[PDB]
Amino acid sequence: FLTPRHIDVQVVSQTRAKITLEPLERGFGHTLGNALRRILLSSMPGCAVVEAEIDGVLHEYSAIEGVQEDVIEILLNLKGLAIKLHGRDEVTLTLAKKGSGVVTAADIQLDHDVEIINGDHVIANLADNGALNMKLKVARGRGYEPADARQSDEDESRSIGRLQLDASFSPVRRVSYVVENARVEQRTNLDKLVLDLETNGTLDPEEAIRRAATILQQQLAAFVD
Amino acid sequence: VIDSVDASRVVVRVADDEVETGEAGVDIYNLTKYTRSNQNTCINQRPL
């Protein structure tokens, strides 16, 4: 009998953001709260580094000269990046730095459609006797996918040159919902939802509820037809 | 005092107190890379 209209988005921080949709009917508050929690963690649009190609190393196990951290530790730091793709689905990024200076997420060349959220995220430590240069390639996916499942874009010749990573992108980390009480002066059984959303910054919390609404409506439409 | 830190090797200086007459600062520490152990496990050393 009641429908949520004109929800409120209380942004308290860049990562943590709480939302209070609307005071719903009793019984449907706790039902929609647990239903929306499993949607934000199952399938959400995200972007991460799929593969990284270095023109100075053959495989990911052997280390290089000039970098303090190992190559394996470098590939483990690229997973923590938060790259937002507005228009393009797959883009190629570059990175190159020479000298005694640490490299961060801001060292990547800027683009008109590529926006990196974090800038203080370190990658590796450099020195004066060595330098690094590599090419990054990100893509848009839905859920977790290992490197052995997405076996595509290969010609039996890029084995020693190209290095693949483990795509584990997840824009949502923590979801918490409680049942509060509200007054509308129409009925006595009113309750609202307070979703404690924890997004890494790849997507806006306002669009997270809209993207989680069209997927639930598409699953419930099978019962009507 | 450490002179230069690298993933392959690390070098350190020698203090003037506990040093000899000639060739005071000589310290070459070669860190081992990913080699095969006796149980088919990996072993490596990372500078800290």
Swiss-Prot record, chain A:
One of its GO terms (cellular component) is DNA-directed RNA polymerase complex. It comes from the Bacteria. Residues 1-225 are annotated as: Alpha N-terminal domain (alpha-NTD). One of its GO terms (biological process) is DNA-templated transcription. One of its GO terms (molecular function) is DNA binding. DNA-dependent RNA polymerase catalyzes the transcription of DNA into RNA using the four ribonucleoside triphosphates as substrates. Belongs to the RNA polymerase alpha chain family. The N-terminal domain is essential for RNAP assembly and basal transcription, whereas the C-terminal domain is involved in interaction with transcriptional regulators and with upstream promoter elements. This is DNA-directed RNA polymerase subunit alpha. The lineage of its organism: Bacteria, Pseudomonadati, Pseudomonadota, Gammaproteobacteria, Pseudomonadales.
UniProtKB/Swiss-Prot annotation, chain B:
It comes from the Bacteria. Signal peptide: none annotated. DNA-dependent RNA polymerase catalyzes the transcription of DNA into RNA using the four ribonucleoside triphosphates as substrates. The RNAP catalytic core consists of 2 alpha, 1 beta, 1 beta' and 1 omega subunit. When a sigma factor is associated with the core the holoenzyme is formed, which can initiate transcription. Belongs to the RNA polymerase beta chain family. This is DNA-directed RNA polymerase subunit beta. It comes from Pseudomonas aeruginosa (strain ATCC 15692 / DSM 22644 / CIP 104116 / JCM 14847 / LMG 12228 / 1C / PRS 101 / PAO1).
